[PDB]
Write a protein that binds this ligand. Sequence first.
Ligand SMILES: CCCCCCCC(=O)OC[C@H](COP(=O)(O)O[C@@H]1[C@H](O)[C@H](O)[C@@H](OP(=O)(O)O)[C@H](OP(=O)(O)O)[C@H]1O)OC(=O)CCCCCCC
Ligand SMILES: CCCCCCCC(=O)OC[C@H](COP(=O)(O)O[C@@H]1[C@H](O)[C@H](O)[C@@H](OP(=O)(O)O)[C@H](OP(=O)(O)O)[C@H]1O)OC(=O)CCCCCCC
Ligand SMILES: *[C@@H]1O[C@H](CO)[C@@H](O[C@@H]2O[C@H](CO)[C@@H](O)[C@H](O)[C@H]2NC(C)=O)[C@H](O)[C@H]1NC(C)=O
Lengths: 328, 123, 347, 349, 338, 336
Amino acid sequence: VTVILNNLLEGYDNKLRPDIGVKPTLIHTDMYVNSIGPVNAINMEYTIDIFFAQTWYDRRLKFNSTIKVLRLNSNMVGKIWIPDTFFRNSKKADAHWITTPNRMLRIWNDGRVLYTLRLTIDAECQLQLHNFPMDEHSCPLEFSSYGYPREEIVYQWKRSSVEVGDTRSWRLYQFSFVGLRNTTEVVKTTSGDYVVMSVYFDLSRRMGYFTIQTYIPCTLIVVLSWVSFWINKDAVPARTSLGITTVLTMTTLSTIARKSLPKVSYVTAMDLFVSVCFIFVFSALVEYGTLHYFVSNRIAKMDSYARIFFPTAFCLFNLVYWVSYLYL
Amino acid sequence: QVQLQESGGGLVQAGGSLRVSCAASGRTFTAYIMAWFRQAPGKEREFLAAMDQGRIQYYGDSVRGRFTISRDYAKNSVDLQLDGLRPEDTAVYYCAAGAGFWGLRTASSYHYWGQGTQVTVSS
Amino acid sequence: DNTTVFTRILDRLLDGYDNRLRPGLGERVTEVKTDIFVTSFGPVSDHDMEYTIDVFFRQSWKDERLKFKGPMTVLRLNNLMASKIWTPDTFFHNGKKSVAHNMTMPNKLLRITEDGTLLYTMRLTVRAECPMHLEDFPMDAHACPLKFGSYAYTRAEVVYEWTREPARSVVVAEDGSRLNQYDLLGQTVDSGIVQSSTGEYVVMTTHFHLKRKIGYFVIQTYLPCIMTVILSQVSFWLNRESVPARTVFGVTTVLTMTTLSISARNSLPKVAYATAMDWFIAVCYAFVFSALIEFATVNYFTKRGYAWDGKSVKTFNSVSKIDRLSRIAFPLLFGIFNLVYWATYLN
Amino acid sequence: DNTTVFTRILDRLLDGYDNRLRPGLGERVTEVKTDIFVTSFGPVSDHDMEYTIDVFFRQSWKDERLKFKGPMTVLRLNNLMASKIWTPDTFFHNGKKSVAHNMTMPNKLLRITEDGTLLYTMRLTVRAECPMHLEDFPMDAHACPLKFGSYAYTRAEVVYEWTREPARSVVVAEDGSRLNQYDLLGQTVDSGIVQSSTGEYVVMTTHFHLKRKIGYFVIQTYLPCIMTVILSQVSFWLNRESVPARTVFGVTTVLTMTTLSISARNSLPKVAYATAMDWFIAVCYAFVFSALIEFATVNYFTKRGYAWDGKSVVKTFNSVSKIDRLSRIAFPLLFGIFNLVYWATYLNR
Amino acid sequence: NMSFVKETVDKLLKGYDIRLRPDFGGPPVCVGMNIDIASIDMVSEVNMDYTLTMYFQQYWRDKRLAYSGIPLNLTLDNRVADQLWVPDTYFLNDKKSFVHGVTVKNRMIRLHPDGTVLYGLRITTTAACMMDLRRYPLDEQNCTLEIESYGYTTDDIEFYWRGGDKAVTGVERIELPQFSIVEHRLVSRNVVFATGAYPRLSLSFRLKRNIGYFILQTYMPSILITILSWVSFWINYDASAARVALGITTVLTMTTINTHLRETLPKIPYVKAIDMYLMGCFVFVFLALLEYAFVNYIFFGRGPQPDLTDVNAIDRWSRIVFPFTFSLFNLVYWLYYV
Amino acid sequence: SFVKETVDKLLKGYDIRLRPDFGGPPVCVGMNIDIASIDMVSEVNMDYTLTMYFQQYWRDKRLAYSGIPLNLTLDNRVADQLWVPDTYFLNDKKSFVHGVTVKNRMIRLHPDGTVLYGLRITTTAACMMDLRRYPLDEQNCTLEIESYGYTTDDIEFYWRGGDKAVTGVERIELPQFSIVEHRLVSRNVVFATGAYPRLSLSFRLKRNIGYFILQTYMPSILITILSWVSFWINYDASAARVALGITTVLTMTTINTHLRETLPKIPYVKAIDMYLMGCFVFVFLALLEYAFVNYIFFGRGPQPDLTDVNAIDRWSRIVFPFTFSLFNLVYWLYYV
Ligand SMILES: CCCCCCCC(=O)OC[C@H](COP(=O)(O)O[C@@H]1[C@H](O)[C@H](O)[C@@H](OP(=O)(O)O)[C@H](OP(=O)(O)O)[C@H]1O)OC(=O)CCCCCCC
Ligand SMILES: CCCCCCCC(=O)OC[C@H](COP(=O)(O)O[C@@H]1[C@H](O)[C@H](O)[C@@H](OP(=O)(O)O)[C@H](OP(=O)(O)O)[C@H]1O)OC(=O)CCCCCCC
Ligand SMILES: *[C@@H]1O[C@H](CO)[C@@H](O[C@@H]2O[C@H](CO)[C@@H](O)[C@H](O)[C@H]2NC(C)=O)[C@H](O)[C@H]1NC(C)=O
């Protein structure tokens, strides 16, 4: 049954799509998400590993025989018209070539052609990093043909369009897979109108890592500056030095809290928290710089007021902060 | 202190070969350019030969094809195979070593210098 | 000359041979016999949850179209003819950007025996994915898998199997450790069948059992955290009146534990939960922070601001009934916690 | 039948042509004439002892098998024609990872003149080696070489030679500099011979001469070390009864100099000797080390542990120390005398 | 309908010589370019480069590829672009670049029935900048992209922007996290090398840097830490271990801000505009600690032996001058660099 | 010409799928290495980068030509039309033949059939390093050259010239290390498929010490000494003798934290972790010394040496400069 394949390619022009003067080819795509890698917030990327299938009807590949399917290697891919599907928001997309070209090609007797290849895509996701790190994102994965317009190639999803694996073995460290969408749109560029498929992966961040690294050390050092209100007056080197190392540590914690972020030019919800955590550290030494001056040179009962007001005004802030970024 | 001790020969028949050597001590010159020079009486220092780290022989245009420089990177030395000695080659031969900044032909680029070896070609 | 007869054999094997068709296409399944020789189990990356491995990926099957009757029984051939003969499309299921080496030639060998049995082997560098559960970091153990099967052929066309009693198939080189953080405690191989959307595929599995060597984090994290809690409990043994001196203990040792709480998370991927090392730091931060709440309590009841003189018995201060108990409670409760910690997680 | 004439010329040149044979293989040497247009002398990496350069690497030789007679005196051909013609196997003797660009097509031009004289340029990004002598760091200079020659063809087969008076055959574009840290002072063009295990080869050589601008390390290293020694010399001007305050000068400025002495040798090869910046820090560490041993001596002779109240004249108070009245002058002087010998030893060479 | 197109493409490529330029002995071929920028990925000050992903298209007219009977625009497969003449246009700023190859190599060939050829490419190039960081981070940056033919001079090939002000699209949709694209220009000119006069196009940009990051990172901490060095003027002069511990810990914190910023920036041989500010705020911290040593010298050294020879007068002087001298330092700074 | 017909006679029916003497004796492939440089020897990645001129001599009777007295140095693209051995490197992580301006190969045919096939290979070979004596240790980095598809029944390896095969080792000047010796070992190894020949070029990388003194040791000495200033300060200065020991246990931490950034995650105690934990004890005991003094005078006050307060300081001024000098004498003689 080598004779079936040789007659299938004799007189076959792989430069020409099927129905080149007749119809737009209908391609039923199908995607199996193997894993979603680390959403790199610095480069605004995410890695995705997929098995990507395409079915189209090629009338030139019909054959009248008994076998009814031709389960083939990747040795036939270079001899058949394959659609020029590119991922529109990819940055470093690579097919797999170990140990063989990981491609699959199956031809039925009516001309339908299944084509599946394994791909890793470092796609682009413009992370709107407001409400950091309590943000939700819908990272897109768009693809279309490159040279063939709407009048020549039309894509379409199937009834089992995007299939999801186990979701436990994924490399989503900070995020959590909460949803999945798809859509169909026609963009308008210079070289025609192209039918662009799009898969939106709804991602929400867990907020377990930044609590341990940022929020818990920033709260337990604002409380560290509250120790000085119980240390008495006229303990002048100890009241002072407790209120500078607490400032020195806020300089260290604000610096390290911006390492995972890119160089965004606005105020995130973490940057609102740390900047307020400067102020309760700032207004603890200016409190003693007031109380040391106006006693040696009411105001004398300021430590009776500051032991109540500063634990109140910080816990009142967390009532305003943690509600306006989780509710309302 | 870095000492570029030399050796070789003093007198030779016109038409006889000679081998002038230069051992080094105090610094590993396996990354420097070790070169030879020539100073005639009443004349400036003239370049003769140089070998880089990558065994690349840079010869002077008046002395090309006659002399053959050869380094020994293990013993930290440099040799100069004098061959075909005309009587116009009677001078003092110096052993230099340096990085060659504005150099490899210019004598002002070599920081370490030898003492000198009077080579007399008699006819 | 002499090698003309061997060219006549090799050209006769390829006349009419179609490399696009499976051997026994309408007769039987293709029973591919795999074998793995791990030359070096390379370094495992926690930040990527992957591991490098350098194998001699052997696989063998029977092809009834490559029979020959020549002067010798085994054609130990070049790697060029392997691209003209059907080779199974084995791919790694949890694979990543892995490398087939091409120095100085493509590292492949193909050996045709006189009955048509092939020995197509490859020297790969597989970077497989290892899903890690870091809840017991660093006192844990992993089972990093290799999973390889065919890509275009289901269980009805190509069936994989191991050679030589499968636990003896995947063998590692004894001088090929290449692990500086982990410890390979043997492997466990198994077959399997994966229900995909295009059919049922035969999958060979191999689970490498790893275990993390604790000794790096004892030196760099556990000892600077213990020697800070001991350091913050030095301040109990001082007098009550050294308020500019005992404050420097209770503020620096909070800065020290804050510094250690940052540079200990850099040895991990940014997971969204507390590891077993973070529960050690958060409790060692509690003994340090309670060593200053103790001093703020002692300074709340100190009445005289001058210390004791070396000639008197003026009213001098007492020796702080809180502090005489805190020199027994704080060194003991930190000793009780280490027996709770190091016996729960060391098993 | 318009362009069939030039197709007939190109097919005639490739009939009896063998691209595996040097022109005049048993006849003569092949004088290859080179030329380099440096477009951008890219950033020099100190940690790898390498540099990057972006050149238009020109070549020219005479192949007598490509003589033709047509309407044009020169065939400005495509880059595909260069793969079917013998081109010399010039490699760079100190290249680490060099890139022959092919965006969007392979950046090669081939121009066959009517008598066989070829021209063949390439756009290369050579990441070459540069052995550095970092003894006078950062006030030093380097001569980074760029050395190329044939790989297979010896001295008796292919002889390279610069065109048009070799000192002006390596020209640098004035626009592209790409040297943020260093400063290109000019190049030196020479030519040499190797003695490999296979034979003598002709080796061209272009030494690019660099000079590190020291403006970065004054801001990051020298001025934080000078302003730390001054902070250690503030403590001589306090009273000797402020032991919990003059200690804070003499120990934190050691912690400052410890931070500077560790993070100064970043982005440097871990050499087996002291750089000229290490002879500055280790002496500035000794003016801060000795500013605390000085206070340990003044504290050892302090009798009365209480300060001057103000309403009295010299109860008995402590006099101003004779060690302090000397060390207010000696430590700013001996640091300033060292700060003249240091910047005159190294800025004169 | 189907075999007629197959026999038409087979005769366009029959006897087609891809080594020869269209009108090889005649007039120069006019190549018109068109860029659709997808995104600018990263603009690195350390490597002095930017990563640019774009849809790079070229129109030219090749009379050999002129089919007659088919009333269509034959979009061929991208493998025929290895069998056609395409221009050898390169990028002079290019460090590292690659044509994307998923799922095939992203090219297109759209033959038109008069011989016009469209040749699209999806190129991700890492082109180099030359940044003048004297006004960093309050600067504007010019980063170009020099497009040029390699082997063909201006006698053989000519370049033009199709729609000379609307040739490059998608610039307004670029979302950079740190910069802000002000404008872009399109220049068509000719450069002269030693081998001939080559046509050169150049897409340029004006990258204005935003300072929403640098306030919260460097400026606003360096303001508050400098103000906390001024707490030692409302503290009594008898407290030796308190007015010293302010100024000693504050020169630590003004050092650790400077030692972090040097890691993200290249070996710059000059003072930046952020090094004019951190070194400037260091002096107000350093003079607030020399102020106490001038107080601690008069009350104890010149004791038994602006207003001077008075301890409380210098403190009452410095409580007004340093909130006035530093407030003039910001007014000179934020008007000279803004 | 005459040469163009001669080369076509050599490559007419030349089957590159067949070993020389495919049914007879094994071919003797003699090797020769001319090392250009060793680029970077990284302990973090446990490897080293080696750039060399890798050459192979064998003879092939199918490539014998008469009449021409010259050695036919052909173009490098004819090496895709000849038989070349499939020699590889076991330590190879990532290697590449240099391809600027062409792929750097050479084919030098000799008139008796001897073939030179030279390569310019930059390989990144692996070394598992024994860092127990870091940074005072020697190393051993090898390069395991081996045939892949041909057993010892088919191919044989030998170094050409004996010990003069690998040259260019004396030209290498590593900034970190120092090459002591190199060895050339020829043997056979047995896998599950057959006995394969193997060559190996080993080295002995002895680490220089001048970097780590100015980086780690000499600061950590002069900071341990500045914890000894507290024994000269009077015991009444509580805020001064604490601020010495508290800043000094911070300063010994910053030396430790700024060292593990450029160093792998090995579990065992190195010779520099044994020293920095060793100098941390002399700092930590100098702060426990004050709290021992501050407890006796103020806690035991109101109610070797004696419990006199001045006697403990005068004892500690002699013992700690003696014990720390004894610590360095044990340290710098056990590892050096
Ligand atoms: C986190 C700890 C919080 C503890 C909160 C504890 C808060 C609390 O209520 O403390 C009261 C007391 C303080 O003990 P302490 O000895 O420090 O204080 C003495 C006490 O105030 C006397 O009453 C004073 O004498 P007087 O007759 O007035 O003249 C005496 O002064 P003088 O004699 O020098 O002149 C003071 O020194 O502590 C306990 O009884 C043991 C508690 C052990 C608690 C241990 C908990 C671990
Ligand atoms: C690193 C420096 C090491 C210096 C080591 C120096 C070690 C050494 O031997 O010092 C002795 C002496 C101490 O000087 P200093 O003035 O500090 O000490 C005075 C001295 O003890 C008098 O005897 C005391 O008076 P007296 O008893 O009542 O009469 C007087 O107290 P009082 O009057 O207030 O009551 C003390 O203040 O120093 C010099 O003379 C200058 C040496 C300069 C040496 C060079 C200094 C650079
Ligand atoms: C084939 O391509 C040509 C060139 O793009 C098309 O001609 C253009 O058609 C648009 C409308 O679609 C007009 O606005 C332009 O003015 C036309 N330009 C020229 C130069 O003719 C042509 O329409 C396309 N034909 C098909 C069938 O798609």
